[PDB]
Design a protein. Structure first.
Ligand SMILES: [Zn+2]
Lengths: 97, 178
């Protein structure tokens, strides 16, 4: 589960929608199954057929592991304040002198 | 009966546009796109309960403005009929038995659920291969025209729809969504 920034709020539950599965034990459609009209047959004279749809849930941390964002989002100008104590500047200054 | 007035078969379908107005969201034209042998019966069964007011010919039907229709659900067709099985004292009179059946002021269930607000006559099928404009299944025959002429219900009729909703005085509660 990808994230985008540091304080990105997250849901504890991830609902999922799945197609119903045959198998002749539960050959009849269950009670908690809804019907969706999204079985395509044709497209130019568009034709759709019913399809039984089941619903389940998932929980973050036990099935899906939360990932982290890559790169840098917030952009700031460099604006490096000059320092007169590090070694590199102390040698560059003597070289200029 | 075969009235002399001729109308396109797409007038019985609300979602498919007809003469005048516009034709966006459904790219068809009159008398060139037809209906198969099931969608015509679909349009025929929609007559008694979803007939709009219209322009000239204001008289819509037994419910005038179509109201909300509420009914109890189930998970099977035989099961669905059981919840909404409410027989009345008198089962009216048949209205689809080939008789126009001019009744009295008081009407019944079999004469109310099968109302015919408009005289309708479907023409013979035309050979071909194209699909219809409602369900889109390719077929062999289609119907391209019909004879529709408006008819007004008698005024002051007494009929309470079993599945209707009324506000305070029998006026239909429609959906005020725009
Ligand atoms: Zn059709």
């Amino acid at each position: 589960l990808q994230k985008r920034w540091h304080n990105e709020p997250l849901p504890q539950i991830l609902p999922c929608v799945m197609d119903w599965i045959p198998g002749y034990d539960g050959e009849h459609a269950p009670d908690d199954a809804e019907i969706h009209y999204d079985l395509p047959v044709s497209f130019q004279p568009p034709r759709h057929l019913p399809r039984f749809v089941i619903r389940r849930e998932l929980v973050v941390g036990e099935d899906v592991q939360v990932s982290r964002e890559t790169g840098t989002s917030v952009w700031r100008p460099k604006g490096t304040r000059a320092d007169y104590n590090n070694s590199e500047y102390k040698k560059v200054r003597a070289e200029r002198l | 009966d075969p009235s002399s007035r001729i109308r396109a078969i797409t007038d019985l379908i609300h979602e498919i546009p007809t003469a005048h107005n516009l034709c966006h969201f459904k790219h068809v034209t009159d008398y060139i796109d037809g209906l198969c042998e099931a969608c015509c019966i679909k349009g025929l069964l929609r007559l008694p309960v979803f007939t709009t007011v219209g322009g000239r010919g204001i008289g819509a039907g037994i419910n005038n403005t179509p109201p909300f229709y509420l009914l109890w659900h189930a998970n099977d067709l035989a099961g669905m009929l059981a919840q909404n099985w409410q027989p009345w004292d008198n089962m009216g009179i048949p209205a689809w038995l080939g008789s126009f059946q001019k009744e009295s002021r008081e009407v019944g269930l079999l004469a109310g659920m099968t109302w015919l607000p408009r005289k309708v006559y479907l023409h013979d099928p035309v050979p071909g291969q194209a699909a219809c404009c409602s369900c889109g299944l390719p077929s062999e025959a289609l119907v391209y025209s019909c004879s529709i002429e408006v008819e007004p219900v008698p005024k002051g009729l007494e009929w309470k729809d079993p599945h209707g909703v009324y506000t305070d005085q029998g006026k239909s509660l429609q959906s005020k969504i725009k």
